[PDB]
Design a protein around this ligand. Structure first.
Ligand code: LBV
Ligand code: LBV
Lengths: 315, 315
C-alpha cells in the first residue's frame, strides 16, 4: 500500500527528494515524451479534449484547432473500429492499434486505450517469429536461474539493447540482478543488490497494472498536454497506460547518473504480484519500434508464466 | 509407446485400414501439399538433394535442374544467415524464416529447419498485437474451462476459422471437446467425446514434438518429392517438422466425411505430455498465412502454460 500522492507540480505540489520520492504522482505528469504526440477524446462522442503541445509536428494541425474536433472527422476509417474495440468498462490495458499514412517517411503508429470515459490516443513515427523460436530454449531451461539467463539473452537479441537484466524483488522489496546479457566491455551488474527505494512503492503498484514503460531519451524534455486537466472530470488525466507518459524527472536523473541514454522495462507478474522486471539500458537514445515493444510485452507474459512453473517444481 | 511403423507405400508398405492405422508412417509420406514447394539440402555444403515435383511452379527452375545446386548459388543473401541460424545439433523444431521476392503477387515465404545433417526448406506464397490483447482475458479467466472458452474464441477471432475446439485427452487417450467457438448455424461439437483411435498413438507422439500441423485443402492430391529417399542416408526423409508435409490419406478421408475443407491443429503440451489440441475446421480450403500460423504457435505455448497454472490451483 503506497502512501497518498503529492499533487503534481502543476497543481502546486512539493518538490521531490530522496526523502519523499514514494509520493511523486508519476501516473499524472500532464506531459509526454517528445518522440510522439498524444490526444485524449470523449469515449462516446469522440470529441478531442486534450492535445500534446507538439501535436502539429506529428498530426499537421495546431493543438488549438484539433481541440473539439471529432475522431470521426479526424480518423474516418479508424473511428468505428476504435470505438468497437474499446467499449466502456473494458480493461485499461486493452489496446487498439492501427497504422496511419503521413507526409513523412515510414508511417504513424496509433495506439489507443480507454480510461473511464476517456480515450487516450498515442501517435508515434515508425519506419514474432523470433519470439516463437525463443520459446523452445525458454521451455527447455532446467530451472529458474537458467530461464532467467535465456530470457535476458533473448531480449538482448530481439532489441539490440546494450544491457538487459532480470531484476528479482525480495519480500522486503529490495532487488537482485539474477541474470544479465550485455554488450562486450560493459561492466557487469550481475548479482548486484539494490535497496527497495530504487523502485518506490507507487511505481511498483503502477507496474503491476501497466506492464511496460520506457524512457526513449533520458535528456529529452517532456511536452505538456493542453489543457492539462481532463475537462470531463476537471482532474488530472491518468497516463499510466500510455507508453509516451513522461518519466519521473527523479528517475531520469538516476538514469543519466548511470550513463544510460534509453531505458525500458517489462514487468514479470506472478499470481497478481510484481515478481520482478526485465530491465533494459541503452547507452544512447533509442526509440524501440511499437511492434518490437509488443513482442516484448508478449515475452513478459510468457516469462511470467514460466517463472511460476519453474518456481513451483521447487515445491 | 506407438507400435513399429509400416514401411510407407512407396517402399511396398501395406494399405491402411481402421485395424492398423496406428502403424501408418505419417512422418515420412515422401510428398507435400500442393500449395507450396519443398527442397532438402546438405546442411554443410548447401547442395540441394531433394525437390518437390512442383518446384518449377514456385521456384522457376526444373526440379532436375535445381538438384545438386548449392543454396549459396540459389539463395545468396539468405544462405549465410540460414546456415548460422541452424547449426548442427540444433532442435529440429527451430526455424529460420525469410521473405523472398518472386515474379507473382505477394512474396514467397521461406521456412527452414534442420533434421540431422539435412536442411528442409519450405516455400509458400503469401500476399501479434491481437495475441498481446488476448493475453488479458486468458490471464483473467477464473479456471480451466473458462480459459478454454476464451482460447477458442480468441483463435476463431484471429483466424476466421468456421470451428475452433479445444480437445482434451483423457488418461485412456479418449478425448472430449471442452470448449468450442463456431460460426452461427454450425451444429455444436461441444461436449462430444471421441475414441482414442481418432488420433492414433504415432500421431499423438509426433504432435508432442512438432506442435502445429494442417491440411489446407482436404481434396488436394499430394506432390511427391524427388528422389523420394534422402541421398545422405538412402532412407526416407523425415517431414514431421514441415507444415507442407502431406497429411495421412486416412485422416483426409475422415475430414471429407465430416464436411471439412481445411483443418489445422496446435498441440497443448504440459510437462512434456500431450494434454490436448486446439483443433480448427473450415468448410472450404484455406491456406492460413505463415505469420498467422506463427501467432497460433505462440498462443499454443501460452495456453499450455496457462493450462498448467489453472489446473494447479485446483490442487
Ligand atoms: C527517491 C526516488 C528515487 C527513485 C524514484 C523512481 N525510480 C523509478 C523507476 C525505476 N527505477 C529502476 C532502478 C534501476 N534500474 C537499474 O538499472 C538498476 C540497477 C542496475 C536499478 C536499481 C528501474 C528499473 C525503474 C523502472 C523504470 C525503467 O525501467 O527505466 C521511478 C518510476 C519512473 C517512472 O515510471 O516514471 C521512480 C519515481 N529511484 C531511486 O533510486 C530514488 C533516488
Ligand atoms: C484408424 C485411422 C483413423 C485415424 C487416423 C488419423 N487421425 C489423425 C489426426 C487427427 N484426427 C483428429 C480427429 C478429430 N478432428 C475433429 O474435429 C474431431 C471431433 C470433432 C476429431 C475426433 C484430429 C484433430 C487430428 C489432427 C490433425 C488435424 O488437426 O487435422 C491422423 C494423423 C494425420 C496427420 O498428421 O497426418 C491419422 C493417421 N483417425 C480415425 O478416426 C481412424 C479412422
Amino acid at each position: 500500500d503506497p502512501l497518498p500522492f503529492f499533487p503534481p507540480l502543476y497543481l502546486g505540489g512539493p518538490e521531490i527528494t530522496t526523502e519523499n520520492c514514494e509520493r511523486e504522482p508519476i501516473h499524472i505528469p500532464g506531459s509526454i515524451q517528445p518522440h510522439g504526440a498524444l490526444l485524449t477524446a470523449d469515449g462516446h462522442s469522440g470529441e478531442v479534449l486534450q492535445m500534446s503541445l507538439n501535436a502539429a509536428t506529428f498530426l499537421g494541425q495546431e493543438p488549438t484547432v484539433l481541440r473539439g474536433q471529432t475522431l470521426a472527422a479526424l480518423l474516418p476509417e479508424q473511428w468505428p473500429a476504435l470505438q468497437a474495440a474499446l467499449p466502456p468498462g473494458c480493461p485499461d490495458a486493452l489496446q487498439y492499434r492501427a497504422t496511419l499514412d503521413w507526409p513523412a517517411a515510414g508511417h504513424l503508429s496509433l495506439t489507443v486505450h480507454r480510461v473511464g470515459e476517456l480515450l487516450i490516443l498515442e501517435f508515434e513515427p515508425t519506419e514474432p517469429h523470433a519470439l516463437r523460436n525463443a520459446m523452445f530454449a525458454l521451455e527447455s531451461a532446467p530451472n529458474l536461474r537458467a530461464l532467467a539467463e535465456v530470457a535476458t539473452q533473448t531480449v538482448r537479441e530481439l532489441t539490440g539493447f546494450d544491457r538487459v537484466m532480470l531484476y528479482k524483488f525480495a519480500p522486503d522489496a529490495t532487488g537482485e540482478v539474477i541474470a544479465e546479457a550485455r554488450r562486450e566491455g560493459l561492466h557487469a551488474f550481475l548479482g548486484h543488490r539494490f535497496p527497495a527505494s530504487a523502485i518506490p512503492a507507487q511505481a511498483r503498484a503502477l507496474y503491476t497494472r501497466h506492464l511496460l514503460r520506457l524512457t526513449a531519451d533520458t535528456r529529452a524534455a517532456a511536452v505538456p498536454l493542453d489543457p492539462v486537466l481532463n475537462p470531463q472530470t476537471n482532474a488530472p488525466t491518468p497516463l499510466g497506460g500510455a507508453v509516451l507518459r513522461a518519466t519521473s524527472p527523479m528517475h531520469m536523473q538516476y538514469l543519466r547518473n548511470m550513463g544510460v541514454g534509453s531505458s525500458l522495462s517489462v514487468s514479470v507478474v506472478v499470481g497478481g504480484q510484481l515478481w520482478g522486471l526485465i530491465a533494459c539500458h541503452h547507452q544512447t537514445p533509442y526509440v524501440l519500434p511499437p511492434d518490437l515493444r509488443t513482442t516484448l510485452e508478449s515475452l513478459g507474459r510468457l516469462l511470467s508464466l514460466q517463472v511460476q512453473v519453474k518456481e513451483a517444481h521447487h515445491h
